[PDB]
Ligand SMILES: C=C(C)CCOP(=O)(O)OP(=O)(O)O
Ligand SMILES: C=C(C)CCOP(=O)(O)OP(=O)(O)O
């Protein structure tokens with residue numbers, strides 16, 4: 086017997102906020118918290134795979150995060166490179182399929198190369214699908230699908246009055262996966278900050294003051310339970 | 317001096333849920349609570365106009381609410397007709413601009429005629445803009461703008477690679493108003509249920525267990541205060 090999605094929850098998306106505050110609370114630089122955040126990513130991926138969750142989607146770098154300090158942005162990119170190298174073989178051994186959603190053109194060659202290669206090694210895996218939203222925005226996401234449909238119309242392949250919700254739905258990120266059931270946002274802010282707008286239309290939303298680097302299995306189970314009791 | 321938006325809040329959207337439960341808690345039929353909901357709409361519109369809020373957007377009938385019982389749907393439509401007649405002259409006297417957002421084609425002539433006429437009487441008003449989301453869906457909203465852009469492309473007026481966020485932004489409902497600052501959802505459910513997906517990208521989200529027919533000025537002030545303290 087397989088672990089049937091802990092509490093009926095197939096797809097969880099998480100806004101991993103509070104890294105900066107967590108480090109500052111300790112007198113440390115912001116990047117120290119992002120490093121602590123990665124252990125927290127490791128912990129969440131593990132919990133999801135072990136509890137039958139079909140897909141876990143993590144908000145790692147927003148399309149608005151480029152306005153941050155150039156030096157903070159650089160260390161983020163290098164940390165992502167470092168997480169890919171340190172975790173990939175284990176993701177493959179664990180039957181996890183790795184997908185990065187967002188505009189990867191803006192990334193440096195090294196990072197782009199790591200992503201392409203990590204996705205190709207795990208492309209045929211059938212366990213948990215782990216989606217890392219990097220340089221991602223919900224509006225950007227809708228627009229990419231809208232462009233795929235605009236093109237089709239310029240190719241006389243489609244009529245403007247044929248376009249409807251389900252068609253656009255077939256063109257936004259993760260449409261081939263189960264819909265998002267639960268969005269958990271750590272850090273205490275009560276907003277969704279351009280995360281999966283289209284996809285979260287009927288998703289449960291859970292907010293915790295717990296900061297991302299402190300988010301653990303118990304906190305994840307808590308969210309899951311809140312979802313199971315969503316009566 | 318004018319009342320500067322109570323706590324810096326220009327545009328509030330409200331998911332008016334809990335009518336059914338509120339009536340049932342009292343042994344009454346569901347429609348009794350929707351009738352009580354309308355007094356609650358009156359109370360919220362009043363509070364918004366008196367506290368300098370620029371726009372108030374109310375979720376009154378979702379595009380998913382047609383699957384409800386035919387008889388419940390009919391009384392809803394008639395109640396909307398009844399609210400238009402009972403409130404319009406007062407909205408005009410109060411300098412409120414009335415806009416209905418959603419697909420009004422699905423409404424019966426009488427209701428469509430009331431809407432068109434109520435909007436034309438108040439079209440030039442300059443105080444609070446009151447948007448009633450009726451037969452509205454956030455996805456539907458994005459798609460209507462996407463169609464306006466598809467058409468333009470079939471008319472060789474636009475190239476698929478020209479379409480971007482701000483352009484689509486200029487084609488979704490309420491783009492000429494201040495963005496949505498705060499979404500309040502009464503009734504206790506923690507989801508946004510297809511409400512303003514595109515527009516709520518950076519909006520504060522507030523959830524209360526209070527049921528819609530019981531929502532009052534004190535509850536509205538509470539939400540406003542929570543927003544002012546959104547640090
Ligand atoms: C997912 C990213 C890029 C950052 C998450 O934490 P923050 O760096 O936003 O730090 P806080 O100030 O919000 O606490
Ligand atoms: C805005 C509409 C159409 C209904 C709001 O309350 P409900 O009728 O959903 O009643 P509840 O069961 O949710 O309590």
Ligand SMILES: [Mg+2]
Nearest residue numbers: 102103104272
């Ligand atoms: Mg943050």
Ligand SMILES: [Mg+2]
Nearest residue numbers: 333334335503
């Ligand atoms: Mg309801």
